[PDB]
Amino acid sequence: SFEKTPAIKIVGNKFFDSESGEQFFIKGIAYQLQTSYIDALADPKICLRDIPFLKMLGVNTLRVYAIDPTKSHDICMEALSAEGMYVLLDLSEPDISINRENPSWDVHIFERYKSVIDAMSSFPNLLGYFAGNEVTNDHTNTFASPFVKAAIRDAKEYISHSNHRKIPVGYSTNDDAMTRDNLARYFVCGDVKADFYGINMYEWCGYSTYGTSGYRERTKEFEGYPIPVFFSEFGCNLVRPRPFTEVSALYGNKMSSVWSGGLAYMYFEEENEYGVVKINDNDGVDILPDFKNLKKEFAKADPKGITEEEYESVECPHIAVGVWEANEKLPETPDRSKCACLDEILPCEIVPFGKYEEYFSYLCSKVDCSDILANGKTGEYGEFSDCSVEQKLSLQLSKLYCKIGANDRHCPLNDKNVYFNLESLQPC
Numbered sequence: 131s132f133e134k135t136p137a138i139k140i141v142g143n144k145f146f147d148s149e150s151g152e153q154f155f156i157k158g159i160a161y162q163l164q165t166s167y168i169d170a171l172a173d174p175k176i177c178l179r180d181i182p183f184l185k186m187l188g189v190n191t192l193r194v195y196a197i198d199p200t201k202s203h204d205i206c207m208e209a210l211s212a213e214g215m216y217v218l219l220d221l222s223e224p225d226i227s228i229n230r231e232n233p234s235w236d237v238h239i240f241e242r243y244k245s246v247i248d249a250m251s252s253f254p255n256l257l258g259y260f261a262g263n264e265v266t267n268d269h270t271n272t273f274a275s276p277f278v279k280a281a282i283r284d285a286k287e288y289i290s291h292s293n294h295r296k297i298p299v300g301y302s303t304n305d306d307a308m309t310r311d312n313l314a315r316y317f318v319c320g321d322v323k324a325d326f327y328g329i330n331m332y333e334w335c336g337y338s339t340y341g342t343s344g345y346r347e348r349t350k351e352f353e354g355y356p357i358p359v360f361f362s363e364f365g366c367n368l369v370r371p372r373p374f375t376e377v378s379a380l381y382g383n384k385m386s387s388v389w390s391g392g393l394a395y396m397y398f399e400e401e402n403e404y405g406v407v408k409i410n411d412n413d414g415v416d417i418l419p420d421f422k423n424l425k426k427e428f429a430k431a432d433p434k435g436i437t438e439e440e441y442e443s444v445e446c447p448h449i450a451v452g453v454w455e456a457n458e459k460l461p462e463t464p465d466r467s468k469c470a471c472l473d474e475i476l477p478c479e480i481v482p483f484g485k486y487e488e489y490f491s492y493l494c495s496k497v498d499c500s501d502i503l504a505n506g507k508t509g510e511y512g513e514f515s516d517c518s519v520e521q522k523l524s525l526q527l528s529k530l531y532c533k534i535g536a537n538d539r540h541c542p543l544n545d546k547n548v549y550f551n552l553e554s555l556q557p558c
């Protein structure tokens with residue numbers, strides 16, 4: 131039974147409980163242990179240990195940054211539902227993410243996003259998905275953002291064409307002064323838009339105030355933003371134990387008319403001093419001084435919202451060199467069929483199983499690698515720029531093979547990982 135968690139839906143720039151019609155405010159915490167990552171929601175002995183404490187905290191939402199899609203999550207997701215708890219979930223994972231230094235939106239990242247969506251979308255208490263987390267994070271990598279927007283578009287379209295509930299897809303951003311206005315506007319401009327927007331917000335440290343923290347300014351900054359907005363992280367730890375007095379302001383009347391709440395960072399203590407509990411060496415939960423403060427603050431918080439009943443495409447920011455360099459034109463939807471046909475017909479392949487940059491530098495000096503390049507500044511995306519890194523390398527190696535012209539099945543690069551594709555000879 132998921133009775134205690136009706137699906138949340140989005141109307142205008144607010145969240146609403148789809149049964150009651152009452153505005154939904156996130157009172158949350160990040161929940162992630164440090165496959166490279168650990169999936170606490172796929173291990174009942176972990177998630178069932180912590181839910182009682184999460185209940186004590188009084189949270190109604192968790193943020194999870196990575197799950198393993200090959201594992202079951204029904205037991206943990208049901209247990210969360212039985213305590214009124216929802217999940218915000220990143221589609222990416224540290225080893226499969228849009229690389230902000232060398233961005234791409236390709237079939238390999240798309241397949242990861244699809245796997246998570248297919249693993250998690252049957253749960254009514256899945257609040258939403260993030261299509262990226264702080265990808266662009268300063269003025270030197272703004273050109274990463276068109277790739278995120280494409281991913282937002284393709285994730286929404288995949289969900290739309292599936293049989294699943296239409297779970298919203300949004301974005302989570304950082305708080306860099308030079309980029310934050312342009313980023314906010316970019317992700318709701320043009321024909322593609324985030325469904326919701328999270329900011330990792332650390333401006334309020336210790337016993338600050340609404341005016342002095344910068345919260346007042348951020349609030350008036352985001353007034354009228356056409357999609358729901360919230361703190362996907364908060365909790366500056368400059369002063370400890372964290373008083374979490376930012377919570378009184380966030381759910382106060384001035385802020386609750388704008389923001390849909392926030393999630394504290396985070397549950398587990400991991401030698402970074404952001405936890406509210408520490409797991410001891412007997413695998414038990416030790417409560418830390420921050421805990422009571424977060425608990426009492428969430429407990430006093432009583433956001434007053436409006437009910438669902440009582441409740442011009444935005445222009446994209448112009449380009450300026452060194453300031454904003456995200457083109458409005460987005461890359462195409464990654465095409466697994468087109469790309470999988472490269473695996474079938476190319477004479478020379480490379481197995482994934484790095485030295486990619488060396489190999490690229492080498493091969494792209496001998497043949498024209500335009501067709502695998504993707505430029506988020508200029509909005510120029512090559513025909514095979516959506517394929518995987520291996521397929522792109524294989525394409526260029528095969529072009530060099532054909533240009534040399536020996537036809538002796540002898541791929542013009544030495545590496546254990548290079549092989550001649552016998553399937554290429556069999557008469558996409």
Ligand SMILES: OC[C@H]1O[C@@H](O[C@@H]2[C@@H](O)[C@H](O[C@@H]3[C@@H](O)[C@H](n4cc(COCc5ccc6ccccc6c5)nn4)O[C@H](CO)[C@H]3O)O[C@H](CO)[C@H]2O)[C@H](O)[C@@H](O)[C@@H]1O
Pocket residue numbers: 160162195196220222223224225226227228229230231262263264265332363395396
């Ligand atoms: O797409 C953008 C980039 O994504 C990286 O992966 C991603 C990864 O970095 C990110 O990591 C988050 C990590 O961002 C998040 N987090 C929270 C914090 C606390 O920050 C407090 C803080 C610290 C210093 C500050 C300094 C100034 C101002 C404020 C500050 C705040 N630190 N980490 O904790 C999560 C674990 O608890 C962790 O999963 O999770 C995602 C999803 O799974 C991967 O997509 C990739 O690895 C990069 O290759 C890629 O470029």
